[PDB]
């Protein structure tokens, strides 16, 4: 089915954005931990 | 420091859930592909 | 404190493990796709 | 399941690169954690 594959596609686009958000949150966390080095 | 760490910790709990959810969506995608292959 | 940092460190190791499952699932989809390539 | 399949392959590849960013970020975090242990040690005894 090209509809099934179309569905997989749509889910993959969403997972891409979800992973990009996880990355961004981890980068933020990284900065927080950096602060604490001398602080 | 202890306050910041608690905020980081809480965030890491939510990221774990988000990652595990992504993994789950991928395993379901894997199922869909397998079903097409079976066909 | 020591305790909170330890809990954070453990959490980061769990995310390492969780992310490796994501990577492994991706790899398994690729394998399943390759099977289609042959026929599909 | 051909042109569509190729689209899916492109997406799975993109997702692989996205995940690599996530793993790199985790690696950098750990590096900052080790720096934080260095400090904590030196600033104590």
From Swiss-Prot, chain C:
One of its GO terms (biological process) is positive regulation of single-species biofilm formation. Coiled coil: none annotated. Stimulates the phosphotransfer from phospho-DegS to DegU. Affects protease and levansucrose production. Belongs to the DegQ family. This is Degradation enzyme regulation protein DegQ. It comes from Bacillus subtilis (strain 168). The gene is degQ.
